[PDB]
């Protein structure tokens, strides 16, 4: 019954080099979105292949910008794609929920500025010059994620606390602050943690680039990159990238008003899903139980589960590619928000794994929201490549009970890989890992700010809940470049026993861990288990562990 293909709707702005007043049109979107942190507006800016002059595309909230060529250099800006922090007086720590992909930039002063914090991916980009990751003035910033990109010149983080870069090429790298992690990055600075705090891996164990919309002549298609094992450098540097092109008419083009029943029928009938920019309320889980289904969002397309249901369930199948979606909790508590596979799923998916990419979760902030566990990863071999799972610390509908969310991510499957894992503020364990042979490359956590007192976070005989917990029964696990920060501003007398908790076993290893008290608001007692120095002072100096056990 469901028809594939069709128009992308009014929230997808499509430009070509002859479009009149491109600058004016992009500036109009930016004026609307610049400080629109919790609004319901959503935009995707899409540029047809060609050359664009005299352009400074300033990117505000819920705005994605992208080229429509097969390769990044097919769509070239003589100009910039800019994120700065003017709206927040130079503070970039609320620069969320936006993206840039599949463009070449020739920045007007030789350096492009992408001064972002969480959920602001920078993918498949070619910067013909430098890349500045800091706001003008070098104020606060908490990014960040770069993948499959080539930066001809230097990447300069300056004040950025931490950063993850994978499968990329850089001309240089200026500095590190607390945790700069690299995997498969040509030109990455050599491993040197703690000083500078560089965690450097030669290759990424497995990666698969995010699917993207492009134009084949006048036909819209979605390119679906093939996976790489031991990846290094860009996927597109040497011409033809391997992968499949899916015609747009093989996608159900989701637009506001669609029901989960219609969406589920579309997948059942063999269509992929393309979520146009908008906010979608569902009264039952979106269910993806067909192998190789692509579920791709544009313009920070958002799914809100009503009536306490789960927003998204992926079945026990190979090859599902979920990308570019925000899942936003409803005020009625959901048991789970996102489930990948069923409870106890024990089949493998090694050759053709399911992946979540640029999948973001929010609980509270745009009104009250609640969920018990945000993402449960049951399926073996699943790849989590850039996620921000965030219990809101500011906005509307926020409070220790008002937007309670006990658990962020729970990984139960085996051989799960997380690259670029950002999880913050949950009332209990931000991340728990129960499956075997888990790997995490880069972790950023901040603990809940609003714990009212010590008793409220007592975890048996432990003060507080680990930001990252590996179950005692696990035999094999490995993490690289991982940090947990605390800011107990409701009760600064609080003590957090550790950032990390894990069994002491030969096969369970950690590299480059740190915990940080932000301005002395609470302190850590240790880094992992009861190992590592406590934090002290109010000077925000990290306490570090290079190797564990
Ligand atoms: O705004 C809401 C969001 O808050 C996010 O966490 C912020 C956290 O980012 C902030 O940290 C700052 C650090 O950024 C700052 O780093 C210094 C660098 O800027 C400077 O260049 O170098 C020095 C070291 O040489 C760094 O210390 O340092 C200050 C303390 O001096 C930290 O406070 O702290 C905020 C609380 O004050 C905290 O809210 C959070 O991740 C988001 O989830 C949240 O929505
Ligand atoms: O006008 C161009 C300028 O726009 C603003 C950005 O912050 C700069 O990176 C850029 O050079």
Coordinates of C-alpha atoms and ligand atoms in Angstrom, one line a residue:
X1 CA 0.0 0.0 0.0
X2 CA 2.9 2.4 0.8
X3 CA 4.4 4.3 -2.1
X4 CA 8.1 4.9 -2.2
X5 CA 9.9 8.1 -3.3
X6 CA 8.4 11.5 -3.9
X7 CA 9.0 15.0 -2.8
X8 CA 11.3 15.7 0.2
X9 CA 9.0 18.5 1.6
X10 CA 9.5 22.1 2.6
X11 CA 12.1 21.6 5.3
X12 CA 14.7 20.3 2.8
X13 CA 16.2 23.3 1.0
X14 CA 17.9 22.3 -2.2
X15 CA 20.3 24.8 -3.8
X16 CA 22.4 24.8 -7.0
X17 CA 25.0 27.4 -8.0
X18 CA 22.4 29.4 -10.0
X19 CA 19.9 29.7 -7.1
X20 CA 19.2 33.4 -6.4
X21 CA 20.5 34.9 -3.1
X22 CA 21.8 31.6 -1.5
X23 CA 23.5 33.7 1.2
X24 CA 20.3 35.4 2.1
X25 CA 18.3 32.1 2.3
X26 CA 20.9 30.4 4.5
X27 CA 21.1 33.5 6.7
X28 CA 17.3 33.4 7.1
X29 CA 17.4 29.8 8.4
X30 CA 20.3 30.7 10.7
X31 CA 18.5 33.8 12.2
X32 CA 15.6 31.4 13.1
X33 CA 17.8 28.6 14.4
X34 CA 20.8 30.3 16.0
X35 CA 19.4 30.3 19.5
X36 CA 16.6 27.9 18.9
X37 CA 17.9 25.2 21.3
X38 CA 14.7 23.4 22.1
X39 CA 12.4 24.5 19.3
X40 CA 10.5 22.1 17.0
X41 CA 11.8 23.6 13.7
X42 CA 14.1 21.3 11.6
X43 CA 16.1 22.1 8.4
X44 CA 18.3 20.3 5.9
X45 CA 20.4 22.4 3.5
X46 CA 21.3 20.4 0.4
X47 CA 23.7 21.6 -2.3
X48 CA 23.9 20.2 -5.8
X49 CA 27.4 19.5 -7.2
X50 CA 29.2 22.6 -8.6
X51 CA 31.1 25.6 -7.3
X52 CA 29.7 28.1 -4.9
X53 CA 31.4 31.5 -4.3
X54 CA 31.0 34.2 -1.6
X55 CA 29.3 31.9 0.8
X56 CA 29.4 31.7 4.6
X57 CA 26.9 29.1 5.7
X58 CA 26.4 29.7 9.4
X59 CA 24.8 26.6 11.0
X60 CA 22.4 27.0 14.0
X61 CA 20.4 24.4 15.9
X62 CA 18.7 21.4 14.1
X63 CA 20.4 22.3 10.8
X64 CA 22.2 19.8 8.6
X65 CA 24.2 20.9 5.6
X66 CA 25.4 18.6 2.9
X67 CA 26.6 18.2 -0.7
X68 CA 24.8 16.0 -3.2
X69 CA 27.8 14.7 -5.1
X70 CA 29.2 11.2 -5.0
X71 CA 32.4 12.7 -3.7
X72 CA 33.0 15.6 -1.3
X73 CA 35.0 17.6 -4.0
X74 CA 32.0 17.4 -6.3
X75 CA 30.4 20.2 -4.2
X76 CA 32.9 22.9 -3.4
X77 CA 32.4 26.1 -1.4
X78 CA 34.8 29.0 -1.9
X79 CA 33.7 30.0 1.5
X80 CA 32.8 28.5 4.8
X81 CA 30.5 26.2 6.8
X82 CA 30.7 28.0 10.2
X83 CA 29.6 27.3 13.8
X84 CA 30.5 29.9 16.4
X85 CA 29.2 30.8 19.8
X86 CA 28.1 34.4 19.5
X87 CA 24.5 33.7 20.8
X88 CA 25.9 32.3 24.0
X89 CA 28.6 35.0 24.6
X90 CA 31.5 32.9 23.3
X91 CA 30.6 29.7 25.3
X92 CA 30.2 26.8 22.8
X93 CA 29.1 24.2 25.3
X94 CA 25.5 24.3 24.1
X95 CA 26.3 24.1 20.4
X96 CA 24.4 20.9 19.8
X97 CA 22.3 19.0 17.2
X98 CA 23.6 20.0 13.8
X99 CA 25.8 18.5 11.0
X100 CA 28.0 19.0 8.0
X101 CA 28.7 16.3 5.4
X102 CA 30.0 15.6 1.9
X103 CA 31.4 19.1 1.0
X104 CA 34.8 20.6 0.0
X105 CA 35.6 23.9 1.7
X106 CA 38.0 26.6 0.6
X107 CA 37.6 28.8 3.6
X108 CA 37.9 32.5 3.0
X109 CA 40.7 33.3 5.4
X110 CA 42.3 29.9 5.0
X111 CA 40.7 28.4 8.2
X112 CA 37.2 27.0 8.7
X113 CA 35.6 27.3 12.1
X114 CA 33.4 24.4 13.5
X115 CA 33.1 25.4 17.1
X116 CA 30.7 22.7 18.3
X117 CA 30.0 20.6 21.3
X118 CA 28.1 17.3 21.3
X119 CA 25.9 15.7 18.5
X120 CA 27.5 17.9 15.9
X121 CA 29.1 15.5 13.4
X122 CA 31.6 16.5 10.7
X123 CA 31.7 13.7 8.1
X124 CA 33.1 13.1 4.6
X125 CA 34.5 16.7 4.4
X126 CA 37.5 18.1 2.5
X127 CA 38.8 21.2 4.1
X128 CA 41.3 22.8 1.8
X129 CA 43.0 24.7 4.6
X130 CA 42.8 24.6 8.4
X131 CA 40.0 23.7 10.8
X132 CA 39.5 25.7 14.0
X133 CA 37.3 23.8 16.6
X134 CA 37.2 26.7 19.1
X135 CA 34.7 29.6 19.4
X136 CA 36.1 33.1 18.7
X137 CA 37.7 34.1 22.0
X138 CA 38.7 30.6 23.0
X139 CA 35.8 30.1 25.4
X140 CA 34.4 26.8 26.6
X141 CA 33.8 23.9 24.2
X142 CA 33.0 20.2 24.6
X143 CA 33.0 18.4 21.2
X144 CA 33.4 16.5 19.1
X145 CA 33.4 14.1 16.1
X146 CA 35.2 14.0 12.8
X147 CA 35.1 11.0 10.4
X148 CA 36.1 10.2 6.9
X149 CA 37.4 13.7 6.4
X150 CA 40.5 15.3 4.9
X151 CA 41.8 18.5 6.4
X152 CA 44.7 19.8 4.2
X153 CA 46.1 22.0 7.0
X154 CA 46.1 22.0 10.8
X155 CA 43.2 21.0 13.0
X156 CA 43.3 23.4 16.0
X157 CA 41.2 22.4 19.0
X158 CA 42.5 25.1 21.3
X159 CA 40.0 25.1 24.2
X160 CA 38.1 21.9 23.2
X161 CA 38.1 19.6 26.2
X162 CA 38.2 16.4 24.2
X163 CA 37.7 15.1 20.6
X164 CA 37.3 12.0 18.5
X165 CA 38.7 11.7 15.0
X166 CA 38.5 8.5 12.9
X167 CA 39.5 7.2 9.5
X168 CA 40.7 10.6 8.3
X169 CA 43.7 12.6 7.1
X170 CA 45.0 15.8 8.8
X171 CA 47.9 18.1 7.8
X172 CA 48.6 18.7 11.4
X173 CA 47.1 18.8 14.9
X174 CA 47.7 21.7 17.2
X175 CA 47.0 20.6 20.8
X176 CA 45.2 18.5 23.3
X177 CA 43.4 19.5 26.5
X178 CA 42.0 16.5 28.4
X179 CA 41.3 13.7 25.8
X180 CA 42.0 13.8 22.1
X181 CA 41.5 10.3 20.6
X182 CA 42.4 9.1 17.1
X183 CA 41.8 5.9 15.2
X184 CA 42.9 5.4 11.6
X185 CA 43.9 9.0 11.2
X186 CA 46.7 9.7 8.8
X187 CA 48.7 12.6 10.3
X188 CA 47.5 12.0 13.9
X189 CA 50.0 13.0 16.6
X190 CA 51.8 10.0 18.0
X191 CA 50.4 8.3 21.2
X192 CA 51.6 10.3 24.1
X193 CA 49.0 10.3 26.9
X194 CA 49.0 11.9 29.4
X195 CA 51.1 14.7 28.0
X196 CA 49.9 15.7 25.5
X197 CA 46.7 13.7 26.2
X198 CA 46.8 11.9 22.8
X199 CA 45.3 8.4 22.5
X200 CA 46.3 7.2 19.1
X201 CA 45.3 4.0 17.3
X202 CA 46.8 3.1 13.9
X203 CA 43.5 1.7 12.6
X204 CA 39.8 1.5 13.5
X205 CA 38.9 -2.2 14.1
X206 CA 35.8 -1.9 11.9
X207 CA 33.9 1.0 10.5
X208 CA 31.2 1.6 7.9
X209 CA 30.6 5.2 6.6
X210 CA 27.2 6.7 7.2
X211 CA 24.8 6.4 4.2
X212 CA 24.0 9.8 2.5
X213 CA 21.6 11.3 0.0
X214 CA 23.2 12.3 -3.4
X215 CA 22.4 13.0 -7.0
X216 CA 23.1 10.7 -9.9
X217 CA 22.4 13.1 -12.7
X218 CA 18.9 14.2 -11.9
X219 CA 18.0 11.1 -9.8
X220 CA 18.2 11.2 -6.0
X221 CA 19.9 8.1 -4.6
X222 CA 21.2 7.1 -1.2
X223 CA 24.8 5.8 -1.2
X224 CA 25.4 3.0 1.3
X225 CA 29.2 2.6 1.9
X226 CA 30.6 -0.9 2.4
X227 CA 32.3 -1.7 5.7
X228 CA 36.1 -1.4 6.2
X229 CA 38.1 -3.6 8.6
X230 CA 41.2 -2.1 10.1
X231 CA 40.3 1.2 8.5
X232 CA 42.7 4.1 8.0
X233 CA 42.4 7.3 6.1
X234 CA 39.4 8.4 4.0
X235 CA 37.1 6.1 2.1
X236 CA 36.9 8.4 -0.8
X237 CA 40.5 9.5 -1.3
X238 CA 41.2 7.1 -4.2
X239 CA 38.1 7.5 -6.4
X240 CA 35.4 4.8 -6.4
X241 CA 34.3 4.0 -2.9
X242 CA 32.8 0.6 -2.5
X243 CA 29.1 0.5 -1.6
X244 CA 25.6 0.4 -3.0
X245 CA 23.4 3.1 -4.5
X246 CA 19.7 2.9 -3.6
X247 CA 17.2 4.8 -5.7
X248 CA 14.9 7.2 -3.8
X249 CA 11.8 5.3 -4.9
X250 CA 13.0 2.4 -2.8
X251 CA 12.6 4.7 0.3
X252 CA 9.4 5.5 2.1
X253 CA 9.8 9.3 2.4
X254 CA 8.5 10.0 5.9
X255 CA 6.8 13.3 6.5
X256 CA 5.1 14.7 9.6
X257 CA 1.7 13.0 10.0
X258 CA 3.0 9.5 9.2
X259 CA 2.1 6.9 11.9
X260 CA 4.4 4.2 13.2
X261 CA 1.9 1.8 11.7
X262 CA 2.5 3.2 8.2
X263 CA 6.2 3.3 8.8
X264 CA 6.3 -0.3 9.9
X265 CA 4.1 -1.4 7.0
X266 CA 6.7 0.3 4.6
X267 CA 9.6 -1.7 6.1
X268 CA 7.5 -4.9 6.0
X269 CA 6.8 -4.3 2.3
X270 CA 10.5 -3.9 1.6
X271 CA 11.0 -0.1 1.6
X272 CA 13.8 1.8 3.3
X273 CA 13.0 4.8 5.5
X274 CA 14.0 8.4 4.8
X275 CA 12.9 10.8 7.6
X276 CA 12.5 14.3 6.3
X277 CA 13.3 17.1 8.8
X278 CA 10.6 17.2 11.4
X279 CA 9.3 15.9 14.7
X280 CA 7.4 12.6 14.7
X281 CA 5.2 11.4 17.6
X282 CA 4.6 7.7 17.6
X283 CA 2.1 5.6 19.7
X284 CA 3.9 2.3 19.1
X285 CA 7.5 1.3 18.4
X286 CA 9.0 1.8 14.9
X287 CA 10.0 -1.7 14.1
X288 CA 12.8 -2.6 11.7
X289 CA 12.9 -6.4 11.2
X290 CA 14.2 -6.7 7.6
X291 CA 17.9 -7.3 6.9
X292 CA 19.8 -4.3 5.3
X293 CA 17.1 -1.7 5.9
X294 CA 18.4 1.8 5.8
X295 CA 16.7 4.3 8.2
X296 CA 18.2 7.7 7.4
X297 CA 17.2 11.0 9.0
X298 CA 17.7 14.5 7.5
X299 CA 17.8 17.8 9.3
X300 CA 17.9 16.2 12.8
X301 CA 14.6 14.5 12.2
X302 CA 13.2 13.6 15.7
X303 CA 11.1 10.7 17.0
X304 CA 9.1 11.1 20.2
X305 CA 7.5 8.0 21.8
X306 CA 4.1 8.7 23.4
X307 CA 2.3 6.7 26.0
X308 CA 5.5 5.2 27.4
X309 CA 6.3 3.1 24.4
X310 CA 9.7 2.3 23.0
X311 CA 10.6 4.6 20.0
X312 CA 12.6 2.2 17.9
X313 CA 13.2 -1.5 17.9
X314 CA 15.5 -3.3 15.5
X315 CA 15.0 -7.0 15.0
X316 CA 17.6 -9.8 15.0
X317 CA 18.7 -9.2 11.4
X318 CA 21.9 -8.3 9.5
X319 CA 22.8 -5.0 8.0
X320 CA 20.4 -2.5 9.4
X321 CA 21.8 1.1 9.1
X322 CA 20.1 3.6 11.4
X323 CA 21.5 7.2 10.9
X324 CA 20.9 10.8 11.8
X325 CA 18.0 10.6 14.2
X326 CA 17.2 12.3 17.5
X327 CA 15.0 10.2 19.9
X328 CA 13.3 12.6 22.3
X329 CA 11.7 11.1 25.4
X330 CA 8.0 11.8 26.2
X331 CA 6.8 13.0 29.6
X332 CA 5.4 9.5 30.2
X333 CA 8.2 7.2 31.2
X334 CA 9.4 4.7 28.5
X335 CA 10.9 1.5 29.7
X336 CA 13.3 1.8 26.8
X337 CA 13.8 4.3 24.0
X338 CA 15.9 2.3 21.5
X339 CA 16.4 -1.5 21.4
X340 CA 18.8 -3.1 19.0
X341 CA 17.9 -6.8 18.8
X342 CA 15.8 -8.8 21.2
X343 CA 16.6 -9.8 24.8
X344 CA 18.9 -12.8 24.7
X345 CA 19.6 -12.6 21.0
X346 CA 22.6 -14.8 20.3
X347 CA 23.1 -15.0 16.5
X348 CA 26.1 -13.3 15.0
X349 CA 26.2 -10.4 12.5
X350 CA 29.9 -10.2 11.9
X351 CA 30.0 -9.9 8.1
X352 CA 27.2 -7.4 7.9
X353 CA 26.5 -5.8 11.3
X354 CA 23.7 -3.5 12.3
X355 CA 24.9 0.1 13.1
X356 CA 23.7 3.2 14.9
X357 CA 25.3 6.4 13.5
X358 CA 24.6 10.0 14.6
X359 CA 21.8 8.6 16.7
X360 CA 21.1 11.0 19.6
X361 CA 18.9 10.6 22.6
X362 CA 17.5 13.4 24.8
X363 CA 15.6 13.1 28.1
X364 CA 14.0 16.3 29.2
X365 CA 15.0 19.9 28.2
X366 CA 12.2 20.7 25.8
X367 CA 9.7 19.8 28.4
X368 CA 9.6 17.0 30.9
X369 CA 10.8 13.6 29.6
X370 CA 11.6 10.2 31.2
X371 CA 13.0 6.9 30.3
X372 CA 14.4 4.0 32.4
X373 CA 17.1 2.8 29.9
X374 CA 17.8 4.8 26.8
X375 CA 19.6 2.4 24.5
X376 CA 19.8 -1.4 24.9
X377 CA 22.2 -3.1 22.5
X378 CA 21.3 -6.8 22.4
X379 CA 22.6 -7.8 18.9
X380 CA 26.1 -9.2 18.6
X381 CA 28.6 -7.3 16.4
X382 CA 26.6 -4.1 16.5
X383 CA 28.5 -0.9 15.7
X384 CA 27.7 2.3 17.6
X385 CA 29.5 5.0 15.6
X386 CA 28.8 8.5 17.2
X387 CA 26.0 8.7 19.7
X388 CA 25.1 11.3 22.3
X389 CA 22.8 9.9 25.0
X390 CA 21.9 12.8 27.1
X391 CA 19.7 13.3 30.2
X392 CA 19.1 17.0 30.0
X393 CA 20.9 19.2 32.5
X394 CA 19.3 22.5 31.5
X395 CA 16.1 23.7 29.7
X396 CA 12.5 23.0 30.6
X397 CA 11.3 19.9 32.4
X398 CA 14.6 19.2 34.2
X399 CA 15.1 17.9 37.7
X400 CA 16.3 14.9 39.8
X401 CA 12.8 13.3 39.5
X402 CA 11.3 15.6 36.9
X403 CA 13.4 14.1 34.1
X404 CA 14.8 11.0 35.9
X405 CA 16.6 8.6 33.6
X406 CA 18.4 5.8 35.5
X407 CA 20.4 4.2 32.7
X408 CA 22.0 5.5 29.5
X409 CA 23.3 2.7 27.4
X410 CA 23.3 -1.0 28.3
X411 CA 25.3 -3.3 26.0
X412 CA 24.3 -6.9 26.3
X413 CA 25.5 -8.3 22.9
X414 CA 29.0 -9.7 22.2
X415 CA 31.7 -8.1 20.0
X416 CA 29.9 -4.7 20.1
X417 CA 32.1 -1.8 19.0
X418 CA 31.5 1.8 20.0
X419 CA 33.4 4.6 18.3
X420 CA 32.7 8.1 19.6
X421 CA 30.6 7.4 22.6
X422 CA 29.0 10.4 24.5
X423 CA 26.7 9.6 27.5
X424 CA 25.8 12.1 30.3
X425 CA 23.9 12.9 33.5
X426 CA 22.0 9.7 34.2
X427 CA 20.7 9.0 37.7
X428 CA 22.5 5.7 37.9
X429 CA 24.9 4.0 35.4
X430 CA 25.5 6.1 32.3
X431 CA 26.9 3.0 30.6
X432 CA 26.8 -0.7 31.6
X433 CA 28.5 -3.4 29.5
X434 CA 27.4 -7.0 30.1
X435 CA 28.3 -8.6 26.8
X436 CA 31.7 -10.1 25.9
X437 CA 34.6 -8.7 23.8
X438 CA 33.2 -5.1 23.9
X439 CA 35.4 -2.4 22.6
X440 CA 35.0 1.4 23.1
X441 CA 37.2 3.9 21.3
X442 CA 36.7 7.3 22.9
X443 CA 34.2 8.0 25.7
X444 CA 33.0 11.3 27.1
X445 CA 30.8 11.4 30.2
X446 CA 29.6 14.0 32.7
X447 CA 27.8 12.7 35.8
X448 CA 24.3 14.0 36.9
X449 CA 24.6 17.6 38.2
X450 CA 21.5 17.5 40.3
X451 CA 22.0 14.6 42.8
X452 CA 20.5 16.2 45.9
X453 CA 22.8 14.4 48.4
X454 CA 25.2 11.4 48.9
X455 CA 22.4 9.0 49.9
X456 CA 20.6 9.6 46.6
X457 CA 23.4 8.0 44.6
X458 CA 24.5 5.3 47.0
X459 CA 25.2 2.1 45.0
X460 CA 25.3 -0.7 47.6
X461 CA 28.7 -0.2 49.2
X462 CA 29.8 2.2 46.5
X463 CA 29.5 6.0 46.5
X464 CA 27.8 6.9 43.2
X465 CA 27.3 4.9 40.0
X466 CA 30.2 4.4 37.6
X467 CA 30.0 6.4 34.3
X468 CA 31.1 3.2 32.6
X469 CA 30.6 -0.2 34.2
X470 CA 31.8 -3.6 33.0
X471 CA 30.0 -6.4 34.7
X472 CA 32.2 -8.6 37.0
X473 CA 31.3 -11.8 35.0
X474 CA 32.8 -10.3 31.7
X475 CA 36.0 -12.0 30.5
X476 CA 37.1 -9.7 27.7
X477 CA 36.7 -6.0 27.2
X478 CA 38.8 -3.1 25.9
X479 CA 38.5 0.7 26.1
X480 CA 40.7 3.6 24.9
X481 CA 40.6 7.3 25.7
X482 CA 37.8 7.6 28.2
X483 CA 36.8 10.4 30.5
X484 CA 34.2 11.1 33.2
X485 CA 33.6 14.6 34.6
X486 CA 31.5 15.7 37.6
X487 CA 29.7 19.0 38.4
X488 CA 27.6 18.4 41.5
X489 CA 26.3 21.9 41.6
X490 CA 23.2 21.1 43.7
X491 CA 25.4 19.5 46.4
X492 CA 29.2 20.1 45.9
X493 CA 29.9 18.1 49.0
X494 CA 29.1 14.9 47.1
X495 CA 31.8 12.3 46.4
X496 CA 31.9 10.1 43.3
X497 CA 33.9 6.9 44.1
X498 CA 35.0 6.4 40.5
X499 CA 34.5 7.1 36.8
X500 CA 34.9 3.5 35.9
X501 CA 34.2 0.1 37.4
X502 CA 35.4 -3.3 36.0
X503 CA 36.7 -6.7 37.0
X504 CA 40.4 -7.3 37.4
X505 CA 41.2 -9.8 34.7
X506 CA 43.9 -10.3 31.9
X507 CA 41.3 -9.9 29.1
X508 CA 39.7 -6.7 30.5
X509 CA 42.0 -3.7 29.6
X510 CA 41.7 0.0 29.7
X511 CA 44.0 2.7 28.1
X512 CA 44.1 6.4 28.9
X513 CA 41.4 6.9 31.6
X514 CA 40.7 10.2 33.4
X515 CA 38.2 11.8 35.8
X516 CA 37.8 15.5 36.3
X517 CA 35.9 17.7 38.8
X518 CA 34.7 20.8 37.1
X519 CA 35.7 23.7 39.4
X520 CA 35.6 21.6 42.6
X521 CA 31.9 20.8 42.5
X522 CA 32.1 17.4 44.1
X523 CA 35.2 15.2 43.7
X524 CA 36.2 11.8 42.5
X525 CA 37.7 9.4 45.1
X526 CA 39.5 7.3 42.4
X527 CA 39.6 6.8 38.6
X528 CA 38.6 3.2 38.2
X529 CA 37.5 0.8 41.0
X530 CA 39.6 2.0 43.9
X531 CA 42.6 2.8 41.7
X532 CA 44.0 6.2 40.8
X533 CA 44.3 9.5 42.7
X534 CA 41.2 11.4 43.8
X535 CA 40.5 14.8 42.2
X536 CA 41.3 17.7 44.5
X537 CA 41.4 21.5 44.4
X538 CA 39.0 23.6 42.4
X539 CA 41.4 24.0 39.5
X540 CA 39.9 21.3 37.2
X541 CA 43.0 19.2 36.9
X542 CA 42.3 15.6 35.7
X543 CA 43.3 12.5 37.6
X544 CA 44.6 9.9 35.2
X545 CA 45.3 6.2 34.7
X546 CA 47.4 5.3 31.7
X547 CA 47.0 1.4 31.9
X548 CA 44.6 -0.9 33.7
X549 CA 44.9 -3.4 35.2
Ligands
LIG1 O1 26.4 24.0 29.2 C1 25.7 22.8 29.4 C2 26.5 21.6 29.0 O2 27.7 21.5 29.9 C3 28.6 20.6 29.5 O3 29.6 20.5 30.5 C4 30.1 21.9 30.9 C5 31.6 21.8 30.8 O4 31.9 21.8 29.4 C6 32.4 22.9 31.5 O5 33.7 22.7 31.4 C7 34.6 23.8 31.6 C8 35.8 23.4 30.7 O6 35.3 23.5 29.3 C9 36.9 24.4 30.9 O7 38.0 23.9 30.2 C10 39.2 24.7 30.1 C11 39.5 25.2 28.7 O8 38.5 26.0 28.2 C12 40.8 25.9 28.7 O9 41.2 26.2 27.3 O10 41.8 25.1 29.2 C13 41.7 24.7 30.6 C14 42.8 23.8 30.9 O11 44.0 24.4 30.6 C15 40.3 24.0 30.8 O12 40.1 23.7 32.1 O13 37.3 24.5 32.2 C16 36.3 24.9 33.1 C17 36.8 25.1 34.5 O14 37.8 26.0 34.5 C18 35.1 23.9 33.1 O15 34.1 24.4 33.9 O16 31.9 23.1 32.8 C19 30.5 23.3 32.9 C20 30.2 23.6 34.4 O17 30.9 24.7 34.8 C21 29.8 22.1 32.4 O18 28.4 22.3 32.5 C22 28.0 19.2 29.4 O19 29.0 18.3 28.8 C23 26.7 19.2 28.6 O20 26.1 17.9 28.7 C24 25.8 20.3 29.1 O21 24.6 20.4 28.4
LIG2 O1 33.5 35.9 7.0 C1 34.2 34.7 7.2 C2 34.3 34.3 8.6 O2 33.0 34.1 9.1 C3 33.0 33.9 10.5 C4 33.8 32.6 10.9 O3 33.9 32.6 12.3 C5 35.2 32.7 10.3 O4 35.8 31.4 10.4 C6 35.2 33.1 8.8 O5 36.5 33.4 8.4

